[PDB]
Design an enzyme around this catalytic site. Structure first.
Site, mmCIF file in Angstrom:
data_model
loop_
_atom_site.group_PDB
_atom_site.id
_atom_site.type_symbol
_atom_site.label_atom_id
_atom_site.label_comp_id
_atom_site.label_asym_id
_atom_site.label_seq_id
_atom_site.Cartn_x
_atom_site.Cartn_y
_atom_site.Cartn_z
ATOM 1 N N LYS F 158 14.517 -52.564 2.829
ATOM 2 C CA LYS F 158 15.730 -51.770 3.047
ATOM 3 C C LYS F 158 16.904 -52.726 3.300
ATOM 4 O O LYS F 158 17.148 -53.082 4.439
ATOM 5 C CB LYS F 158 15.522 -50.787 4.214
ATOM 6 C CG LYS F 158 14.439 -49.721 3.880
ATOM 7 C CD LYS F 158 14.226 -48.548 4.864
ATOM 8 C CE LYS F 158 13.221 -47.534 4.279
ATOM 9 N NZ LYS F 158 13.705 -46.984 2.968
ATOM 10 N N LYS F 184 7.629 -53.971 -1.129
ATOM 11 C CA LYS F 184 7.426 -52.596 -1.571
ATOM 12 C C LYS F 184 8.771 -51.974 -1.968
ATOM 13 O O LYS F 184 9.656 -51.858 -1.138
ATOM 14 C CB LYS F 184 6.706 -51.793 -0.480
ATOM 15 C CG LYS F 184 6.428 -50.404 -0.861
ATOM 16 C CD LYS F 184 5.482 -49.694 0.001
ATOM 17 C CE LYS F 184 6.141 -48.758 0.883
ATOM 18 N NZ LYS F 184 6.739 -47.675 0.074
ATOM 19 N N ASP F 186 10.806 -48.865 -2.265
ATOM 20 C CA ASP F 186 10.753 -47.500 -1.731
ATOM 21 C C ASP F 186 10.403 -46.467 -2.803
ATOM 22 O O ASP F 186 10.851 -46.541 -3.950
ATOM 23 C CB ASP F 186 12.070 -47.185 -1.066
ATOM 24 C CG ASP F 186 12.030 -45.950 -0.223
ATOM 25 O OD1 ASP F 186 11.093 -45.103 -0.307
ATOM 26 O OD2 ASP F 186 12.915 -45.862 0.655
ATOM 27 N N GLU F 187 9.619 -45.478 -2.381
ATOM 28 C CA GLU F 187 9.072 -44.452 -3.264
ATOM 29 C C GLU F 187 10.155 -43.693 -4.060
ATOM 30 O O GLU F 187 9.893 -43.313 -5.185
ATOM 31 C CB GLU F 187 8.205 -43.453 -2.490
ATOM 32 C CG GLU F 187 8.918 -42.680 -1.393
ATOM 33 C CD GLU F 187 8.674 -43.346 -0.025
ATOM 34 O OE1 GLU F 187 8.277 -44.544 -0.018
ATOM 35 O OE2 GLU F 187 8.781 -42.688 1.008
ATOM 36 N N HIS F 277 1.545 -44.631 -3.901
ATOM 37 C CA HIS F 277 2.249 -44.020 -2.795
ATOM 38 C C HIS F 277 2.042 -42.511 -2.743
ATOM 39 O O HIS F 277 1.957 -41.851 -3.755
ATOM 40 C CB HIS F 277 3.689 -44.346 -2.883
ATOM 41 C CG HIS F 277 4.458 -44.070 -1.664
ATOM 42 N ND1 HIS F 277 4.982 -42.833 -1.407
ATOM 43 C CD2 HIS F 277 4.869 -44.867 -0.653
ATOM 44 C CE1 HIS F 277 5.582 -42.847 -0.239
ATOM 45 N NE2 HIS F 277 5.567 -44.076 0.223
ATOM 46 N N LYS F 317 -1.557 -41.805 17.428
ATOM 47 C CA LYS F 317 -2.558 -40.781 17.194
ATOM 48 C C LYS F 317 -3.647 -40.856 18.253
ATOM 49 O O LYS F 317 -3.994 -41.934 18.735
ATOM 50 C CB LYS F 317 -3.175 -40.864 15.774
ATOM 51 C CG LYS F 317 -2.155 -40.580 14.700
ATOM 52 C CD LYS F 317 -2.710 -40.016 13.409
ATOM 53 C CE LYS F 317 -3.620 -40.987 12.645
ATOM 54 N NZ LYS F 317 -3.779 -40.472 11.287
#
Lengths: 138, 22, 444, 142, 138, 444, 444
Positions: F158, F184, F186-187, F277, F317
């Site tokens: 980013k 990566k 971004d999708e 992804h 979690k």
């Protein structure tokens, strides 16, 4: 248990895994050449041209398959047509190495019946070549 | 994966490796 | 259909363009040899009947093979050699597939025969010239590999650590770096879940180029192109082309002659060498009374096209079985082979300058067979070592180096006029004095 | 390579995905049936020797055919049916060529055998479904 | 605020961002290898063969994807089948570095269950290599 | 259509080739569980009616899924697990698209159900072997990347300075040079007015090769190939191939299974790695009572083909939600997974040597989660850092270097037998003493 | 990342080129609505955290969706409509795949939300014009089919005698000959062992041409092109082209938007009509609090491209659920749709001359629903009969003929000014007097 070294351990095809052939060993190979009716010839190369390389392939499309540079070496004089005595080859070996002390020298043989190169083995390594190992190559 | 049980090095192992290096 | 006067014509003069066949023939008891030879000549359209039922055809008037000679087999009581001539017009130009369909398509089921073996074929110059043949042949191969005056040395890769592509390539690198010319995909390694073909090709190409950079000699690995489909097969051949690697491999009897010939033409068109493996040959070629002798299958391969051919071992064979092996090795390699019954050669074969094929011999477990191999095969052969390189106690690279030293010392001793039959043990022991790798292999 | 205890495993349970083979087997006289069945299971890299030489592979630990049963042939004196299981991982999906290379590629030359015939194969559903198969088949054809 | 240097700062995969593993640290990793039933092996390369390169790609058509030269190094002796004690690996490390003082040496491990290389980390950097930084790499 | 005696067959023996499904089922009040399980088995051609109107079909005599078991859900009052067997003949070989059409195509609208969730599927070995599957899988990937014995490290780019292709590539270079294996796309970055795909590909390829020259390690960036059309998608995959770069990326749920499988086959054929992804998964997989649990969507992906898969985070979690995550991580990675209800695994799954997929975990904001991630995932995972590398005060490259040091020290400590649950803070603080980059990240 | 003052900008003026979204939003208790709307606007790179960790991007300064309005939902206590504007620069031109990745890619997992449903989208004229869209649309379709002033009539083929391709084609012939415009591949029928696709295509083409020769009207069958791979999918589309048949079919949600758009472009380029089946829509679109409402998925389809779309049934639905269905039917078919909350239309949609899509309605079991269907849908719809044609006691062709008579009599009565809500039973009974086929269907 010893390790075959990957460093500075270049080979030059037939007989390069033996100790360097003495003059009597070269003379006996020349006797094999002469008895068969074969034509001895000497070839030489400088160390940078001695072993196979791929640099011409930069010019190519997808046809590098079994292409390699430096298979051809440079001929010393001419194929010794009618060679019967081995002392001429031994004299020519000395003359080539005297003119080219930094050169590998190989002895080749041609069979005019089958019209093809039929031998090729090395007769001289240059001292100044660090590319190869003096048979303490482990 | 199994739990790595530690191996004590032999006495004066340090003395053994030092000799070999020389 | 098997009239015996139509098909058995013992005064027929053999034409130069005819294809000749020699069948070793075992008739059913009470069936005369002339009737059986005629039946094999005729390929009757009834294989169950052994009688002429529907007789008179334009497929059976001028396109008929004729049995022109029947000879007894010495020492056998119910076996004959039947010689059959086939006119060249019967055959599709350039199609090994179609020649086997015409000659061996039907007669091996004929009920008048108990057993039938096809021993030899005379392929005429007029048929030979319709074939593309081997992509390079022995000479061109030696020029392209820059390797003269000794056998080539191979080994099959059986990795100790995994069958993954990466471990496969590590082992290829270790063998090649030590002195071997080639390594070899196993014949069943095509593309499996444990090792997909394109991963294998990539890691082998890294290994070949690593050992080549290290040795300064040309190196190869026989990359198995055998596939379920022609398109998958050509996908693999194309990948090898694009990697610029020297050699691929095909299992011509299990892939088939149609695929092998397609592959051999691709290899001629793109300068790849083609190694040929002979898996399933013993299904066909082993039993003395039935099948197709390997020399025929080798002759077929030379026509279909291959630069190397697995040719067996001569370890553990008697002199008589060694005479046979040397017969077909001459049919593989030479331009002109003369009739020689004691070597099992039934016909004079003129290859009419079709390039020869390099036989690939299984060398034994050890390096002490090296003098015998060099004496029997001469220089034009690949010697494959199945565990010489890897049964060596110091690993793949010294094992390769031990095989290369032994080959080169035996070659040197042969050129010096020494008798390798007598003095080969003395040649090896003398090379053991200066080569520690060879000395450790002979400790075994 | 033909150890007889590695390759002849008569208590092996046949998996559903295994390819099975039944070989009618004619051993050389004096060679026991369990040694021959094991040799056919192993496809030893020496076909002349008929003895273990180089033993210990990753092509011979998990990718090995196992001779799981040897039966006599009734009325014959020197013939046996040897049953060999091959794991499905040995085979290229959809390639008849590769299945014959794996099963019949080498063993018919093995010197411990005098004769060898491959009678039957069990093609498992997991292997069968990798093949395109017949273009139409009988029904579609009709 | 410091700058990670781009000069002479080559890495050799796993553990190369740590200080060089001491003998005790190597011995403890070998204990991890042995407890898992893994097979240790040593590999070595000269500095010009130590890190990834693209020079063979000159021969290629469009198939360079995930090809790189020098991933393979040269094996030192054989995989130590049946290794149970860590002092054999430590002795073999010393022997390799003694025979090859200008070589990087890596310790790898193979898992015969999953039939695949499962570890690989460096145990020796050569002093004469200027390619790498002595952990004042900022 | 939902007769309950036809479709609910509780004494049916499950065949080995059947596809099994476990549906968590919420019937409308007053509708008995056996009627609902049967209705889901039947996929009645009336979804509004809930009655058998048109009964007796050859699509419904032998090609019918059968509800062979209904169990209550413990602690719930109106929820059941219905087990449905489907014969393998229902399914198109190798088509994930067609398996979801057959199983989830219609039943989620059935009016007799209030809610319906598909929890698990048993894919039989006979169906599994029809799929090409992942182009490489975890093992091959590690061999091709030369990276063993630790997790892989990624980060999403980013940029602080612009979304232009050139600034995108600068940031890729800075992260990769510091120690990360991957960066990566971004999708959503496919090809926009601010950054067209082919410009992005070229500048990323310069960055990857610059960081690779600098580090001497293999480097990648997941180049997003997701497109509006298959032809545009393949244009991008071809560009990556020609740049010789290692890895591309696809958003398999928004592109679709048909496009994902096409792409996975291209990647197998041309040696590209395929990062997957999972954008929009929470539209389908989040609500406990309705949709399709992610483990099914992960199993689908493994069949369709992907070398990596976004698998969530385990930060924040509870242990019970962590048991579920580890369940599907085993379905992604392993060859054989045993039935284990507490991990949400309803069926024994035999992948039959189909290569595993590398899970990609979101690592947290910081590097102190590194001991937990290494302990939970083990080595076979990519840990993605969303701002570890870039929230670092010294910038992308020291941030990458801080993540790599922390991963490697936790790996070292794990191999040395230390308990990372207890001692992981002590491992990080001890690495802070010699690493100034890690020390500056822990100041945060 | 969810600052609430960066992303919730309630005085923002909506631009004409913006893409707007309306999210029905269920915040976690204690989380204010403005924080949730802002979080959905932001698509924070942390979905577990719900806090701004790494703030300041060039992906989050000018390429940010802004929550410009939050409204309460009447009668609900914890639900809000959040309106989000997205700048058109975010989106890949012509890529439905990329618009869903950008809008629904990540936010449905955000922990600050308990549930999230995407209700509607405003697709601006500037984005609409980047799409090829439907290959023909309703008008062109009617001109190509030569069929005006009534609904089209279809039925799904479920053969009584086998699922073989030949029996499948017999049933197609019998239905089409009786009066139906179309028949329909079932959505799971792709290419199975019981019926391989190319055999199905050939026998259906014989059936279509037989019924066309017999009736003299244009006939079709929706040939399912849905495949595992794009290449298999295009192989089927090409086969239909070469048969010269009118229509193919795709399951756009299980194949995927990438494949559907590729197929829609093929169909535009080769004049095929494209029927779209909506299998798995209820996985996504059914629950009121979570997922993506069908009207969005229909709008997506109209952009990706389809000439017909399965649009549900209105049998068994209340007036309020019928208001919703008619809302999305207008979004499917019309050029300009006005904001209308009671029909669930949250945005004025200007299709900017993009061709409309024909809705396909499930007609009921019987022919007595015909007056309601004609009144609700009007002429521009296909009415599919699931067992009207085949539950008919005289078989497929009189059943088709009974459906066609009932449709035509209801059409006649509608044009004559009769009220089909009141008088539709009287219209059917009056057509029963002269039509024996319709009289036998109404005996049922």
């Amino acid at each position: 248990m010893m390790v075959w070294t990957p460093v500075n351990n270049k080979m030059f095809e037939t007989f390069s895994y033996l100790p360097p052939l003495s003059d009597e060993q070269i003379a006996a190979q020349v006797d094999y050449i002469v008895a068969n009716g074969w034509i001895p010839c000497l070839e030489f190369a400088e160390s940078d041209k001695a072993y196979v390389s791929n640099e011409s392939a930069i010019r190519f499309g997808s046809v590098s398959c079994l292409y390699y540079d430096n298979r051809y070496w440079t001929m010393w004089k001419l194929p010794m047509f009618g060679c019967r005595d081995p002392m001429q080859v031994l004299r020519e070996i000395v003359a080539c190495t005297k003119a080219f002390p930094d050169a590998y020298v190989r002895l080749v043989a041609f069979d005019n019946q089958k019209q093809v190169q039929i031998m090729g083995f090395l007769v001289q390594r240059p001292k100044s070549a660090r590319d190869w190992q003096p048979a303490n190559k482990r | 994966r199994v739990s790595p049980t530690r191996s004590v090095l032999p006495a004066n192992w340090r003395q053994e490796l030092e000799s070999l290096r020389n | 259909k098997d009239y015996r006067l139509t098909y058995y014509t013992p005064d027929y003069v053999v034409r130069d363009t005819d294809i000749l066949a020699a069948f070793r023939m075992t008739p059913q008891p009470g069936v005369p040899p002339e009737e059986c030879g005629a039946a094999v000549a005729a390929e009757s359209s009834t294989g169950t009947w052994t009688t002429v039922w529907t007789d008179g055809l334009t497929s059976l008037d001028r396109y008929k093979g004729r049995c022109y000679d029947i000879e007894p087999v010495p020492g056998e009581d119910n076996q004959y050699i039947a010689y059959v001539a086939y006119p060249i017009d019967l055959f599709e130009e350039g199609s090994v597939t179609n020649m086997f369909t015409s000659i061996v398509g039907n007669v091996f089921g004929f009920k008048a025969l108990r057993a039938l073996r096809l021993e030899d074929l005379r392929i005429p110059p007029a048929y030979v010239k319709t074939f593309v043949g081997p992509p390079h042949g022995i000479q061109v191969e030696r020029d392209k590999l820059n390797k003269y005056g000794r056998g080539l040395l191979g080994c099959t890769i059986k990795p100790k650590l995994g069958l993954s592509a990466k471990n496969y390539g590590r082992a290829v690198y270790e063998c090649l770096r030590g002195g071997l010319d080639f390594t070899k995909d196993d014949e069943n390694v095509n593309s499996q879940p444990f090792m997909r073909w394109r991963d294998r090709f990539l890691f082998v190409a890294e290994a070949i180029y690593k050992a080549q950079a290290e040795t300064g000699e040309v190196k190869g690995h026989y990359l198995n192109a055998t596939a379920g489909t022609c398109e998958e097969m050509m996908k693999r051949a194309v990948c090898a082309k694009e990697l610029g690697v020297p050699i691929i491999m095909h299992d011509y009897l299990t892939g088939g002659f149609t695929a092998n010939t397609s592959l051999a033409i691709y290899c001629r068109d793109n300068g790849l060498l083609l190694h040929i493996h002979r898996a399933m040959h013993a299904v066909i070629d082993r039993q003395r009374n039935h099948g197709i002798h390997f020399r025929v299958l080798a002759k077929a391969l030379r026509m279909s096209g291959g630069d190397h051919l697995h040719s067996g071992t001569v370890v553990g064979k008697l002199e008589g079985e060694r005479e046979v092996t040397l017969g077909f090795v001459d049919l593989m390699r030479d331009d002109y082979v003369e009739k020689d019954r004691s070597r099992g050669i039934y016909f004079t074969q003129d290859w009419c300058s079709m390039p020869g094929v390099m036989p690939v011999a299984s060398g034994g477990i050890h390096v002490w067979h090296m003098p015998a191999l060099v004496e029997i095969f001469g220089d034009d052969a690949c010697l494959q070592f199945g565990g010489g390189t890897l049964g060596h106690p110091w690993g793949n690279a010294p094992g390769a180096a031990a095989n290369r030293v032994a080959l080169e010392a035996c070659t040197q001793a042969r050129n010096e006029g020494r008798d390798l039959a007598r003095e080969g043990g003395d040649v090896i022991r003398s090379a053991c004095k200066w080569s520690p790798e060879l000395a450790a292999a002979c400790e075994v």
